[PDB]
Design a protein around this ligand. Sequence first.
Ligand SMILES: CCCCC[C@H](O)C/C=C1/C(=O)C=C[C@@H]1C/C=C\CCCC(=O)O
Ligand SMILES: CCCCC[C@H](O)C/C=C1/C(=O)C=C[C@@H]1C/C=C\CCCC(=O)O
Ligand SMILES: CCCCCCCCCCCCCC(=O)O
Ligand SMILES: CCCCCCCCCCCCCC(=O)O
Ligand SMILES: CCCCCCCCCCCCCC(=O)O
Ligand SMILES: CCCCCCCCCCCCCC(=O)O
Ligand SMILES: CCCCCCCCCCCCCC(=O)O
Length: 576
Amino acid sequence: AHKSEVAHRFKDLGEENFKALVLIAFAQYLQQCPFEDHVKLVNEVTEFAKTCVADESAENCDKSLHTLFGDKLCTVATLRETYGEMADCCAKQEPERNECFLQHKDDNPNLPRLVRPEVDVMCTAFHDNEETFLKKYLYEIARRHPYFYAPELLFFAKRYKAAFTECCQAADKAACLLPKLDELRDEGKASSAKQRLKCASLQKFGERAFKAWAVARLSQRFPKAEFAEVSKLVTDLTKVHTECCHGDLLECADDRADLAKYICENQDSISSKLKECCEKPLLEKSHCIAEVENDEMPADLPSLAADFVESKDVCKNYAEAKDVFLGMFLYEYARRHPDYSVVLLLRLAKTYETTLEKCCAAADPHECYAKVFDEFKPLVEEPQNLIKQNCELFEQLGEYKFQNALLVRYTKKVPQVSTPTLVEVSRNLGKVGSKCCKHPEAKRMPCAEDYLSVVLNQLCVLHEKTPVSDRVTKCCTESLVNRRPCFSALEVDETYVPKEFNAETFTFHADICTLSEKERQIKKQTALVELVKHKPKATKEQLKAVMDDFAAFVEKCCCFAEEGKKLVAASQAALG
Ligand SMILES: CCCCC[C@H](O)C/C=C1/C(=O)C=C[C@@H]1C/C=C\CCCC(=O)O
Ligand SMILES: CCCCC[C@H](O)C/C=C1/C(=O)C=C[C@@H]1C/C=C\CCCC(=O)O
Ligand SMILES: CCCCCCCCCCCCCC(=O)O
Ligand SMILES: CCCCCCCCCCCCCC(=O)O
Ligand SMILES: CCCCCCCCCCCCCC(=O)O
Ligand SMILES: CCCCCCCCCCCCCC(=O)O
Ligand SMILES: CCCCCCCCCCCCCC(=O)O
């Protein structure tokens, strides 16, 4: 409702942030334009912005942000030659022009791998012209991730900027930097697979599924809030998520900032943990809030049995308004259990619902639903037990060999997944082990759910459109809370015909000695999957015996071709 919207945004964000976000937003629409062209356009938009700051009444200062972006986009002179139909958007009036740009954000980019320079070269470059070096990489990530919400991409950039400061100075520029950059990469990976999971989930499962999830997550977060307040938050969050998924950066950022403002003007009835977030500038407020730790729950909440099992009014209260009642149940359950994953809370509410449907229909409903809590039993135990055993295995073996145990396990279940994907999914599950198994027990399930749900959804995006397995499509298109259970119930594939021996696959040279850590790991792991694909029936003593001998073939050789010939020979018979 301001006179100059571009001026208002520039005085609030601050110039450095405004330039960064302008660069991100243009790079996400104009993906094939070279860095220096985006620089020129940024400088132009920034300079016009300043005229509005100095005089809100200056020409064109009163146009909306949408109009000004669209107008700028339509002055790029090679728009049609490079973008084709996207130039057709320019002929259209603004409500419509802006919708048209939205439908044309490419997403298969098609760009070439971004190779990390050598550390020596990045530090050098960071030092000689810090902004070009950072800004160019923001541009590179943004054009390769055109749906990544722009302020979050800016928040990560500030993290890289921090890291180069830190490390481009000390005794070793590899023992400071590399593990920071590697942690930033996995974490950026997650953040992005996560935004796509939220949006695709809303389509597949519906607003109702989505809302159940939010009731649960926010009840865990704000266990002191009243249900009515939790429900108002999920209704507004639902609408935000919905606008953000439609994709218009300004509209998403407006709704998110409105929700932030509400949250902060109501801290006392939501959470004693919001003080710091609610002091942050607008740009980081909502982001801080979505990341806040769970508040402490209030002391000695009653058990759930009274309102949900014991009351004579159960069926009556349910049937008046079934979703509100199930949402009260889910709220009451989740506030008590910061330690459950959200999907387990859903599985629990969905169980309570299936039980009230059957039983409320009976002459004596109470006798029928009297044991429902006992049904929550094994639902809770199952994920806790799988987590417990996998962290113990992880403790017993360490990451790389845990990764290896995960390879033979998953290759036997779904041998017809390609070798790189199996390698990839297993190295990554190993990372979820090493990050989640450091939580005590009462944090492990929420952790595990976070990362696995990310890892599985991408699994499921790959598979779709490159289908190799009916059992993977089954798990990938299951309901939301059934997905991870479905993968977990996968057994060793008894259908699978062994891959025929391939001579080249188990022949290695001197290189493996000299390549890096990682790459030697991938190479050995590729071979191992290949090993399992050829003898799907190998027992574990037999695999180990063969793995110990590969490491002894590698150990003493660094004889690659004649021994390897008898590495193979000996192996094809300890497995024959
Ligand atoms: C062997 C690949 C190494 C990593 C890939 C490059 O470093 C790009 C850098 C990214 C980043 O930082 C965040 C997201 C992208 C990568 C994600 C998906 C690419 C798949 C579809 C596509 O990009 O065509
Ligand atoms: C992404 C922050 C915005 C600006 C951050 C710094 O400019 C980056 C500087 C880099 C560097 O010097 C070497 C590698 C990174 C780029 C890496 C991956 C791209 C996508 C990975 C992801 O999804 O974060
Ligand atoms: C398509 C043109 C993009 C407009 C430039 C970005 C404006 C900055 C929005 C940042 C506000 C974030 C609000 C929030 O996420 O809580
Ligand atoms: C797999 C997704 C469905 C999970 C739903 C299980 C039963 C809980 C229903 C909650 C309905 C949303 C009502 C609300 O809490 O606002
Ligand atoms: C911390 C476990 C290391 C990673 C290995 C895979 C184990 C999967 C445990 C599943 C818990 C999922 C949450 C849920 O579905 O309720
Ligand atoms: C493409 C499917 C190959 C298997 C790779 C990951 C399988 C899903 C794992 C989910 C976490 C482990 C599930 C489990 O073993 O209980
Ligand atoms: C029939 C071919 C026999 C050689 C193929 C064996 C592949 C062994 C990979 C095992 C590496 C995991 C343990 C390690 O890196 O030391």
